[PDB]
């Protein structure tokens, strides 16, 4: 139901950084597509 | 010195308890030399070797860094904070006068 304390610090950093790494993965994939956009594709 | 032992070699300084009666620059001889050593070292049978007396010079009589004494008891509103700077003395060792007694070392 309810939280007993707060996570407060450092743990919340660890939790957020993985979420930002989701963003990183998307960035890699979007970078990969730009080269595909250059030349061919038929 | 102040009921407190020290290994002591010449041309070299030490910190001790503040010597009551000692001036700023004023040479002194320590007559409680329980051991001497070299190539052929020399222990002691009794205390003091015999006529060995270490030769030193007082440097300065400044106080020690502050030690914080803190009385505390749980829940009784008994926080009591009190500093203490023990007065000390800096002394510089000039030379060891030779032993001439009981040669050990095999």
């Amino acid at each position: 139901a309810v939280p007993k304390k707060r996570t407060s610090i450092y743990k919340k950093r660890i939790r957020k950084n993985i979420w930002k790494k989701k963003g990183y993965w998307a960035a890699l994939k979007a970078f990969s597509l730009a080269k595909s956009l250059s030349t061919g594709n038929s | 010195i102040g009921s407190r032992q020290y290994i002591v070699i010449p041309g070299r300084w030490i910190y001790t308890q503040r010597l009551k009666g000692a001036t700023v620059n004023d040479k002194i001889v320590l007559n409680k030399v329980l051991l001497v050593g070299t190539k052929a070292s020399t222990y002691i049978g009794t205390p003091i070797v015999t006529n060995a007396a270490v030769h030193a010079v007082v440097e300065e009589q400044l106080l020690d860094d502050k030690v914080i004494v803190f009385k505390y008891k749980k829940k009784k509103n008994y926080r009591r904070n009190i500093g203490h700077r023990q007065p000390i003395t800096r002394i510089k060792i000039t030379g060891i006068t030779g032993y001439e007694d009981y040669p050990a070392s095999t």
Partner: protein, 152 residues
């Protein structure tokens, strides 16, 4: 001193965009080529990119006009996203009690950086270690020497 003219701090701010959702994007482009960054930001799948892209391109145009150095040289040195000025709507909920929802904002800043401004000086220090060319008493070893300042 080590740089000062290797940059231009374009700081487009009051962007209506939560700071964490901006840090998803900006954490990827901290230290990239500018060309590459632009190619990334148009293809990326984020609402976050558009205002960032606008500021990257504005910053690079700014750098090309104002301080007049090549866009192909430069990189994104310091990207940084800070908390803006928070607005607070009070929405209702079931059973009479009411809770706030916040419209968060941000202050985005980008420090661009030319690679090859202090390269004349750095490439000259391909000269190997025990050299100490003592000309002006010490002189101009002031160009991101990077590795050590062990000058005792």
């Amino acid at each position: 001193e080590p740089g000062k003219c290797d940059e231009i701090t374009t700081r487009g701010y009051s962007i209506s965009m939560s700071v964490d959702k901006a840090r998803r994007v900006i954490d990827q482009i901290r230290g990239r080529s500018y060309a590459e960054t632009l190619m990334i930001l148009e293809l990326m799948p984020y609402r976050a990119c558009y205002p960032i892209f606008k500021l990257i391109y504005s910053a690079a145009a700014n750098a090309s006009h104002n301080k007049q150095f090549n866009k192909a040289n430069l990189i994104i040195s310091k990207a940084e996203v800070n908390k803006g000025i928070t607005l607070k709507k009070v929405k209702p909920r079931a059973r009479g009690r009411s809770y706030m929802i916040k419209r968060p904002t941000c202050h985005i800043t980008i420090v661009l950086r030319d690679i090859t401004h202090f390269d004349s000086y750095d490439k000259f220090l391909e000269s190997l270690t025990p050299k100490k060319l003592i000309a002006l008493l010490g002189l101009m070893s002031t160009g991101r020497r990077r590795e050590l300042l062990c000058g005792r």
